[PDB]
Amino acid sequence: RRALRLGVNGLPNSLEPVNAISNVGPRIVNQIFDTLIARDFFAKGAPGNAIDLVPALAESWERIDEKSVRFKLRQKVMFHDGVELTADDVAYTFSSERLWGPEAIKKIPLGKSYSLDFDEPVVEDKYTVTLRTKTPSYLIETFVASWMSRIVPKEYYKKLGAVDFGNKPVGTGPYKFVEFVAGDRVVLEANDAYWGPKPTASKITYQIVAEPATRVAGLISGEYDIITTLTPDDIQLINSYPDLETRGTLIENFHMFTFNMNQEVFKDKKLRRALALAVNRPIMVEALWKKQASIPAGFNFPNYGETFDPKRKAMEYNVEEAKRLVKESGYDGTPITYHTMGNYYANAMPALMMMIEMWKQIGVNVVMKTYAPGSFPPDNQTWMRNWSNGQWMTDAYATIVPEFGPNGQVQKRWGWKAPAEFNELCQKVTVLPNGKERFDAYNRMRDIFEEEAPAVILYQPYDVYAARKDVHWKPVSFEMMEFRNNLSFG
């Protein structure tokens, strides 16, 4: 077997699966760990976008009532160190101690904010575990299939603690941990004791190449088998090589810009709305995305299933209203900083360049401020910044409620004073089953989100990868890389 060489845009701060939730972490943690339920993106000849949920660590499951799901676990599944996976490891993964409890905030900072209203799991036997919520939740199944639910070994994790575990991870996944050199690489090796489809690569290296041009030239040399986070502008050149090709897809993620609402200038919605209303998304999608990216009609995505609104109108573009809103606001022409980690996000810097020009035209002077990976400045030194949200549920709950909800980081850390109505509907949607009331509540939340502008949705990026033709791997409609039955050589 060949050793897989990946030229990536970035690396996560940790390999602890919840702390690895980013654009850069899932592509690694998906190799080290498994979930109870997994998604088959390639079901029924789909091009890496199938919504099909299949058994993984749980061979079967059954919803008992409105707040509990019993899982029958796959037997004799071994962790990388030889310890057998039991219901105890599953219970610990979803425990108050490790995940959603008050003390857990020091280990997994976003654990509670991203979790459901969990109640302590129930271990029925060695291979039977019931996951439960304190209040009704029809989201247990989707949460279990998500990036929040990768199963950790209880004894090893507790022995090391969350911080040391994130630097020496042990999972059940197809690839085991070899090395993690921060700001350089993550090396993994084949787990030949894997319960599922056998690893096809002997080794996997995720090498940071922050500059996309250095990344492209890296594949042409070729120092890499696959390179990530490209732009549709890189397409024609890579494809001009007979042994190289681009591989891309629209992913279940949106790019955005957001605000530090603790800053005087961003406390009121006026300037935030003015900046939102001047964003010309169709020109950005032509100039930088060559029609490949997509513009959602608000905080509304097809993956939401029953909570997606297909009748919803597009987000407003109104330069004249934006101009008036700048005039009415307290803003005085003082340069506003916009923080970006270079091109961590595809087209981050070219996108900002276009917006600075759009904003200059409405009377807002915006300045780019670059920061190195891991060198993000203190919160009060930042005003505007770019971000992305992976839509991780087959439901509208994620990410409006975990990110923008009353217990979320946009309101708590970033100072968004959300209207009472918004927070009230967030509570109803978490608890209500699907229906007219729930559908309408999500639509009213979407209306408040656009009126308030705590963040401004830009587009669903078209995720562009490039690879050696002799490396057979197909992208998935999510911000991760899948190698299970989706990696071979020659």
Ligand X SMILES: CC(C)OP(=O)(O)O[C@@H]1[C@@H](O)[C@@H](O)CO[C@H]1O
Residues that bind ligand X (CB under 6 A): 21-23, 253, 387-390, 399, 403, 479
Q: How far is the CB of 80 from ligand X (least distance, A)?
A: 26
- Shorter beta-carbon distance to ligand X: residue 74 or 385: 385
Q: Find where tokens 């078209």 sit.
A: 462
Q: Is 9 or 191 the residue whose CB approaches ligand X more closely?
A: 9
How far apart (Å, rounded) are the C-alpha atoms in residues 143 and 53? 12
Q: 115: helix, coil or strand?
A: coil
Q: How far is the CB of 25 from ligand X (least distance, A)?
A: 8
Q: Which of 388, 342, 336, 385 is nearest to 362 (CA)?
A: 336
**From CA 85, how far away is CA 436, in angstroms rounded?**
41
Nearer to ligand X, 17 or 390 (CB): 390
Of residues 378 and 490, the one with the C-beta less far from ligand X:
378
Instruction: Say which amino acid occupies 131.
Output: L
- Given the complex with ligand X, which of 176 and 385 has the nearer CB atom? 385
In the complex with ligand X, which residue's Cβ is closer, 127 or 462?
462
Give the Cα separation of 29 and 326 in Å (integer): 44
Q: Which residue has the tokens 């729930």?
A: 438
Structure tokens at 352: 């900002």
- The 10 Å Cβ neighbour count of residue 423 is 17
Q: How far is the CB of 289 from ligand X (least distance, A)?
A: 18
Q: How far is the CB of 136 from ligand X (least distance, A)?
A: 25
* 240 CB neighbour count, 10 Å cutoff: 8
DSSP, collapsed to helix, strand or coil, labels residue 388 as strand
Shortest spacing between CB 254 and ligand X, in angstroms? 9
Report the nearest approach of ligand X to the CB of residue 102 (Å): 22
Cβ distance to ligand X smaller for residue 133 or 399: 399
Least Å from the CB of residue 365 to ligand X: 26
3-state secondary structure 199-250: CCCCEEEEEECCCHHHHHHHHHHCCCCEEEEECCCCHHHHCCCCCEEEEEEE
